[PDB]
Every structure is written in C-alpha cells, then in structure tokens.
Design a protein around this ligand. Structure first.
Ligand SMILES: C[C@@H]1[C@H]([C@H](C(=O)O)[C@@H](C)O)N=C(C(=O)O)[C@H]1S[C@@H]1CN[C@H](CNS(N)(=O)=O)C1
Ligand SMILES: C[C@@H]1[C@H]([C@H](C(=O)O)[C@@H](C)O)N=C(C(=O)O)[C@H]1S[C@@H]1CN[C@H](CNS(N)(=O)=O)C1
Ligand SMILES: C[C@@H]1[C@H]([C@H](C(=O)O)[C@@H](C)O)N=C(C(=O)O)[C@H]1S[C@@H]1CN[C@H](CNS(N)(=O)=O)C1
Ligand SMILES: C[C@@H]1[C@H]([C@H](C(=O)O)[C@@H](C)O)N=C(C(=O)O)[C@H]1S[C@@H]1CN[C@H](CNS(N)(=O)=O)C1
Ligand SMILES: [Cl-]
Ligand SMILES: [Cl-]
Ligand SMILES: [Cl-]
Ligand SMILES: [Cl-]
Ligand SMILES: [Zn+2]
Ligand SMILES: [Zn+2]
Ligand SMILES: [Zn+2]
Ligand SMILES: [Zn+2]
Ligand SMILES: [Zn+2]
Ligand SMILES: [Zn+2]
Ligand SMILES: [Zn+2]
Ligand SMILES: [Zn+2]
Lengths: 265, 265, 265, 265
C-alpha cells in the first residue's frame, strides 16, 4: 500500500469558466471567471487588479486586460482580499509577466510568500506559487493610483490577513462607493479553542461589524455568490446584490449556526 | 558638498555593558547587558531566549549561555518583544551559530526579515542583519518548551508586532507568573493622522489595557528602566520593579502628554 | 469550455511505496521509499538527512527516523541533491516538525524558496511547499557533523543547483567513500539554445566529468534505478550498483543521444 | 569596558560627491557620484539602472533620472555588478519609490536579500537594506529592454554572484559595445584554502579570462578608477579608459602579487 498521490485543488467548473470583461462602474471591471472575482480598476496612471482567482487564470486575465486597453506594463498594483489559492493563485506569474507590484498586510504577505502552505486550517492541502509583497499596508492605510483612493479595512477571520478594499468610482457621473469585502466563511474550520487561532471567534465578530459599517453603495465579494452577484446575468448581474449590512448579517447567522453545530459535534 | 556619511546606530554605554547572568527565577536569567534585557529560560528540553539586545551582543550572549550550561545546540527557540535593532539585533547571527529557531507574529517576522529597514517611524535609520522566522504565532497562541508554557499577547503600538510574553516559573518553590511586556514608548513618533499607521492611537490604548491585565507577579521589560529594574543592583535588582498595572498607567500618562505636545507642535 | 483543472504531480506507485530502513553503511541508511532515496546519516552529534523525496513522505520519514533512534530534535541538518518536488518535497514540513536546518547552494536555495515554481523547464507544473535555507554553501565547502565530513560538489545541469554530496562512513570497520550523486537526466528539456539556460550543454559536460572523478567506493542516486540500486532486494540491494564512472558515462551517452534527437526534431 | 559601538560604513568623500549626468553613449549615462558608477540606459520602453552606489544615494539618483526625463514609473529594471553596500546600497529604497524590478543571478539575489550580511569575507561589517530580486538570471542570459539587449556574463570572485553586463549602444551613429565589468579586487580576502570559498582562486582566474574576452569597445567599472575613468574630467572623462584586456591583465597581476604576499604572511 503506497502513500496517497497528491490531490490537485479542483474546483467547480464555473469557477474556471472564462468571461469577457463585465463593467461594474465607469472604471471598474470584473475580468475573472463566472464564479471568481478579479477586479480591474483603470486609471490614467495605470491599472489596479484586486484578486486574480485561480493559478491557471493568469493568461485569461492578461487577455481581458488587453481587451480593456491595459498592457502588461500598464498594470501597476495588485491588491488581495486574502491569500488563498482561489484568489491569489496567479499573483506570482502576474508579477513575472507584468509591471505589477503587490501591496498587502503582513499576514497576507506571509501567507502569500509561502504559497498558501502551512495554512491555519488547510495545512498544505491548498497551495499555489509563492509571491513576495512589495509594500506592506496597515489597517486603514490608503493607496492612491490616478486619484482613485483605495482604503484597506482589516477583517481577520477567514484568514488572519483578510482585508476589505474600498474606493469610490463613478457610474452615470455620480459617485459610487464600492466595497470589495472579503469572505466571511469558515469552511470546515475549528472555531472554538483552536490552538493555531485562539481569538478566531472574537476576530470574526469584529469583522462582521467592520463589514456592516463599510462605505458601501455597491458590495462585491471574492465569490460573487456570497453577495448575490451573478456575473453571467449581463445587464442584471448586480441587480440582486446584497448590501454590506445584509452580507455581514447573513455571514454572522451562518457563523452562529456553525458554532452551535461544532458544540454539538 | 558630498552626501552625508552613514551614521552608525550608537547607544548609551550601559546598553553595551556586559553583565554576568542574573537570576530572575528558578529557571529564568537575565543574560544581556546592564541596560538591555535578554532572558534565558532553561528547561530540561532546551533553552529559550527572549530578545538578544544589540547586534554586537551575540558572542556575549553565547558566553553567558555557556556559563549557564547551555551549549549552542541546546538553544531551541528565540522569542522577541519587538524587531528593532536594540532587541533583535543579534538574531540572525544567533541562528547561524546555534540550533535556535525563531517564533514571531507576522508583523514582527516581516520587520525582522527586512532587518528593521523601512521602519514605519525610523525609515532606514536603525537597521540590523535580517533574519527569517521559522514559526508564525497568532495572538494568544502558546508555545511549550519542557513544560514551560509561553503565551503571546499582542500589544501593537511601539511596533505593529509588539508582543508581551508570559510564562510561569518558580521561585523558592512557589509559582511566579512572569510578564515580559514590550515597550510602550513612542520615541519621536507622529501619533495623530500617521499615514503609515492610521490606527496607532487606538492600538496603543488597547495595548495599555492588555498590559494592565497580564498575569504579572513579576514584570520585566526590554529596557529594564521602563519597569524600574536595575540589573546592576545585585540582590535588589528587582526590588523596585513596577507592577504591570503601574507600568501601563505610567506609559499611558506619558503617551497622553505626548499627544498633547504633538497637538501643540 | 472552462480552463483546465490543476493537475496533481502524480508518480509511479513504487515512488510512494514505504520501506523500512535499509542499511547502506555503518551509519548511513536509506529511509525513503522503494524508488526515492532519502538518506539518514546518524552521528553522535545528531542526524543528517539527504533528501526527503515527495511532499507526502514527511510522516513516513519521521517514523523511520524514530525506528532508528532519531527523534525530531535529533535531526540537525537537511542536505539536498536538487530542489525538485520528488526530492525536496517534504523539507518545509520537516523543518516545522524537527530541529533541522537546511544547507544548500544559492541556486538550490532560490528554487526551494519558491517551492519549485518558475522552474527553468517545468514552469509551475511541479511545485511543492516552499522552504528557506539556513546556510548557503559554496562549491567544495564542507559541513562536519559528529566527525562525518560532507563535501559539496556542484554538478549543475539537471537543475542549476544540482549537487553531489560525498562523505566517508565505515562498513565492516573499513572506510567507505560514499558518493550521493545528483540526477544527470534532462527530462523533456530543450538542451540547445535555451534562453533560460544558455550554457546548459557546457554545464552538463562539466558535470559528467565531476561525477566521473568523485571519491566513490559506493554510488547512490536520488532515483536508485539511475545507479542500479534495488532498494527492495534486501541484502543484494546494492550488489549491481554502478560505479560513478559508469553512471557518468551512461548519462553522457544518453545525453548525446538526446542532443542528436533534438537536432532532428 | 562596554562592547564596541557599531561602526558605520564610511567611505572617501569622492564616493559620496554628487555629479550631474555624464553622457557615456547616445543612451547611456553615468548618474551616480564622482567615484561610484550608477549607469542609466534610456530606451523608448523605459529606463534601466545598472548599480546605484551607496545606500544614501537614492534621492540623488532619482534627481538625476528626473533631469534626464525619467520619472519613477519609467524606471523598469535594476541590474547589479555585485551586491555590496557601495554598489547595491539604495536598491531596496529605489524599488519602493519607483516601478523598478531587480534582475540578478542566484548568488547576487541571496546576498541582496540578506542586505550584505554574512558576507563570505566581511561578515556583518558592511550591510545595507535588504531587497528581493524579481527575476533570476543564468549565465549568458539576455534581457531586452526597448531593443537594448543586456547580456549577463558571470565573473565570480569578488563576490560569488559578480557579473559583467554587456550591451550595444551608439555614439555618433556608430555601434559601441559597452562592457560594465565587475570588480576584480579581493580586498583583505583570504585567497588560499578559504573554507567559505574553496575554489576562490580558480574562479578569479576564470573571471580574468572572461573579462579579457568580453565585447568591449568601451569598458566601465563600478569604481571608475579601476578602468581609468575620471568622471570629473568632463569631455575627457573616458579618454584614458583601459580596454577590457588591460583591466583583466592589471587585475591578474595584482591578484598574483596578493597571492604571493599571503603565502609570505
Ligand atoms: C471552501 C471555499 C473556498 C476556499 C477558501 O477560499 O477558503 C478554497 C481554499 O477552496 N472559497 C471560499 C471562500 O469563502 O473564500 C470557501 S466558501 C465556498 C465558496 N463559494 C461556495 C458557495 N457559496 S456562494 N456564496 O459562493 O454561492 C461556498
Ligand atoms: C528610542 C529608544 C530605543 C529605540 C526603540 O526600541 O524604539 C531604538 C531604535 O533606539 N529603545 C526604546 C524602547 O522603548 O524600546 C526607545 S525609548 C528609550 C529607551 N530607554 C530610555 C530611557 N528610559 S528607561 N525607561 O529605560 O529608563 C528611553
Ligand atoms: C522526470 C523524472 C523526475 C522529475 C525530476 O526530478 O526532474 C520530477 C519533476 O518528476 N525525476 C527525475 C530525475 O532524474 O531526478 C526525472 S528522470 C526519470 C526518473 N527515474 C525514471 C526511470 N529511470 S531509473 N534510472 O530511475 O530507472 C526516469
Ligand atoms: C574595499 C573596496 C570596496 C568594497 C567592495 O566593494 O568590496 C566595499 C565593501 O568597501 N569597493 C571595492 C571594489 O573593488 O568593488 C574594494 S577595492 C577599492 C575600491 N577603489 C579603491 C581604489 N582603487 S581605484 N581602482 O578605484 O582607483 C580600491
Ligand atoms: Cl507591456
Ligand atoms: Cl553545541
Ligand atoms: Cl524530539
Ligand atoms: Cl512616476
Ligand atoms: Zn479562502
Ligand atoms: Zn475562496
Ligand atoms: Zn523599539
Ligand atoms: Zn528599544
Ligand atoms: Zn529533478
Ligand atoms: Zn527526480
Ligand atoms: Zn564589492
Ligand atoms: Zn566596491
């Protein structure tokens, strides 16, 4: 009886289904797949990418950038929700193929630099090519690209370094406060008395309150389903989107249910 | 007119004045200099070092370890208060010369890995040889060596990764709850509206409350003067030591004064 | 049509088939699998591991170490042939679970730290958890553990950082010069005019000459088949082993054939 | 008697004396100080910087770049001769303040990432802010920016990762093959039987032959004096410059003399 083969990180096909760029606001586009968010924000001073999805999405992202008039040298900055393989997967390759630099908090930078290995909950089960951050950000710090101001809001829980990114774009000339809020799930996590994350519950509870209070005319999430987006629905892709308040409340109710089930288990 | 020469990080002589090991508790010793703490905790399962002081202290620390019966292979773990040159200075060299592995939180690990460069407040003015952490710890996580349990208590402010380490040793057979609380100073820092540390004030205030509540029969600090230790006073070195409550209260009063002076400046 | 799923690095079952420790010399043991070498050298001053095989082999290696009387704290040093997933796979996890430090040359250290990603020939197709080296070695440098002297002999080609490690053990009291020579294969490589490795051919040719001249009473290789070892053959496992001269000559003949086939292709 | 203060890395004033850009060829400029080379190559596709000199030179380099019409975003690539503090000093800060990415060989990348600490010959005596390489290059590999092709020629000795960079620019319309050859000095080095660099002598001898054979209409060196440049001499700054052949021969004669003196010492 040999040791088991390594198991590839396989996902639902919709997570890997390419889509053409979908406009969210005047200068903000969804350029990932049907079920994984990768946001391109285009400024006169270069482009920002928030998340890249899975490791195998790099070429697709570059194709969609080209379709939008963003060449590899024009990509200046990569920001991340959190450093798991299904959101930061292609960052190392993107850095090699573009001018982009990565800004992230210390927790996300440490996890990215180990390619998602030694995860607090997944171990080495879900890894990806490691990448280095070029700039470390603190909670509430802003990064400004072409007069678009991105604010980091730490919302630890799903990962220690989970971050919501907020900025203001326009839509029909009017300002739109966009909130890219990270995942608030705890998939298979041990929540209570976890020796690798002793204050997990307290961090999640603080993160629900953080998300509830974000400036949030439009909420987007790394898994669009979490905020009720349907990237395949065209002109109605965002019609059913949740508010940040509703997203936080739904995540807290689910979390409270998981806590109760863990106590019973 | 040439550019200025690089300026060495020079310190008061007492900070560099070697001392013989000073016993703090049954298995805990001060082995640094007169004015910089470096704590050696000896267990049947190897030795732990908390801080090393300045970069040039490595050989002295190794001498004091040998005097205590700790060879290079017996040093198993290095913990840090914070990753500035006067506390983590010799860690890289210690790792090369001993069996020791470094455990630190993500913020301290990132700063250590850049040798203290790009400091939020000091820039590149105070650097030291970079070192890599071998284990990343979360707030409240414990590390157990030979039945001595070290608990990390994050107290961000002086640096983002500032940590208090607590453990229980014995003294005349009775348990002694030791608290190695990090610095609570803000030397020359811009406190209000600091773009590199937007929530600095909130973090300091939370850290005062954290220090005030630590299990703390005996408080030690990286600069012994901060907790009223006098490592040169022999059998009375710890006689005047502050409680954790008094240390936090003194640090908060000083901080409030600095805030008021900054507003006036 | 979605993007392809990630493909796991799957291997022949014999590569993953655990075996009990097989004694090579008085203090040198094969403790990996039937078809992947992982050498444990036991000294009074701690144990050295040369290679670990595939990522999923860590627990098996630790079991075999325990069977040999080597606890996790007794493992002092990990050396590598080259930093591909089937030889350095479990190094990150071994470092987390033992006292071991990694010594490697700069090329191997860079590849290990990126977990085998951005490989000159494999791209990101064959990755593993990244690890950091604790000591960088130069060509011909020696590392001495308990009076066993390990000499590094660089033999670039299969990877830039490919290394042969030599040491002298005993067998029936007599000295035995052991040569752990790295792979000399070029599996699917573009050999001529490779922009990522312009001097590939020259390096391979120099490496054949290096291997031919190693001190080599007993040759071992990361894939035992390359040196005609059969780890499942018990008391005759090493009976058919090649000399270093024969191994180099066979590798050069195969390489010359591949060159000719590449020219024709 | 306290431990000694840290000693700053101080240098001759001419090494820190700013100069205005000095044109070497149509698109190649010396933009460092009077006695430290920092070469700016301007292409329609961005600028390349080869070396930056001392750590405190970053702002001066950026000023000279601006004077040349190169903004921070236009700097695309930093190449290095070798990763000592007087040549790679300001690279970390340049990466933070510009769009530049660093390409270097593995040896130079490892030394840069430790900020010059644990030097084979200097120990920790000469350190600088650590930086990460974005691309690793192999011997003979080319990097092309705006149709300027830079070729790496490894010339190990002064450091393991010492590199000569060659490219072709124009001067009065005619092609000029420029050779930026690294230092061939061994200042205070133990040459024979050095355990940290066993093949030092062989590497230096191979490097003399490499430099002698470089394409070399114009030779430049990190210390301009080594190639008989006088950056303060205006229109005659390069008039007395050595050929690559003469530079190698002078370095070999000096090296042979040092070998003989070491034997006598
Ligand atoms: C297990 C999911 C996956 C993992 C993760 O990011 O933790 C990844 C390692 O596989 N991404 C998820 C995340 O929350 O970031 C978790 S939760 C899962 C993702 N979407 C599934 C269906 N719900 S939804 N809201 O998108 O319609 C639930
Ligand atoms: C400027 C001091 C120094 C610096 C630091 O750690 O920030 C170091 C970069 O120089 N270490 C300090 C610390 O708090 O950790 C600061 S505060 C300074 C240290 N001890 C001085 C005298 N007070 S005491 N309490 O020790 O008697 C004040
Ligand atoms: C493609 C093989 C594998 C790869 C490698 O190390 O390059 C790994 C990424 O899959 N390990 C090999 C090595 O040489 O190190 C190559 S060669 C292959 C290994 N053993 C196979 C059968 N020959 S043998 N000599 O062992 O009987 C050939
Ligand atoms: C000791 C010098 C210095 C050191 C170095 O790069 O090794 C640095 C750590 O201080 N830079 C040098 C180099 O070669 O790269 C060495 S040699 C020294 C530099 N220029 C001095 C005068 N000779 S010259 N040829 O420039 O007129 C000799
Ligand atoms: Cl481009
Ligand atoms: Cl020892
Ligand atoms: Cl153990
Ligand atoms: Cl700019
Ligand atoms: Zn996730
Ligand atoms: Zn996810
Ligand atoms: Zn400090
Ligand atoms: Zn201090
Ligand atoms: Zn291989
Ligand atoms: Zn292999
Ligand atoms: Zn040098
Ligand atoms: Zn120099």
């Amino acid at each position: 009886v040999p040791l088991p083969q390594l198991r590839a990180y396989t996902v639902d096909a919709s997570w890997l289904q390419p889509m053409a760029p979908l406009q969210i606001a005047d200068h903000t586009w969804q350029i990932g797949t049907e079920d994984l968010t990768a946001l391109l924000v285009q400024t006169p001073d270069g482009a920002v990418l928030l998340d890249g999805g899975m490791p195998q999405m790099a070429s697709h992202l570059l194709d969609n950038m080209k379709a939008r008039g963003v060449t590899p040298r024009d990509l200046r900055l990569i920001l991340l929700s959190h450093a798991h393989a299904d959101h930061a997967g292609p960052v190392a390759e993107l850095k090699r193929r573009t001018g982009a630099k990565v800004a992230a908090n210390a927790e996300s930078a440490v996890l990215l630099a180990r390619g998602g290995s030694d995860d607090l909950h997944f171990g080495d089960g879900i890894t990806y090519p490691p990448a280095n951050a070029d700039r470390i950000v603190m909670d509430g710090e802003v990064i400004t690209v072409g007069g678009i101001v991105f604010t980091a809001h730490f919302m630890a829980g799903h990962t220690p370094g989970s971050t919501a990114w907020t900025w203001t774009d326009t839509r029909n000339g009017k300002p739109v406060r966009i909130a890219y809020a990270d995942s608030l799930s705890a998939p298979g996590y041990q929540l209570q008395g976890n020796p690798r994350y002793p204050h997990l519950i307290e961090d999640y509870r603080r993160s629900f309150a953080t998300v509830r209070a974000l400036p949030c005319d439009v909420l987007l999430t790394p898994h669009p389903g979490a905020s009720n987006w349907d990237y395949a629905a065209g002109a109605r892709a965002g019609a059913k989107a949740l508010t940040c308040k509703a997203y936080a409340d739904a995540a807290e109710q689910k979390f409270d249910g998981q806590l109760a089930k863990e106590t019973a288990g």
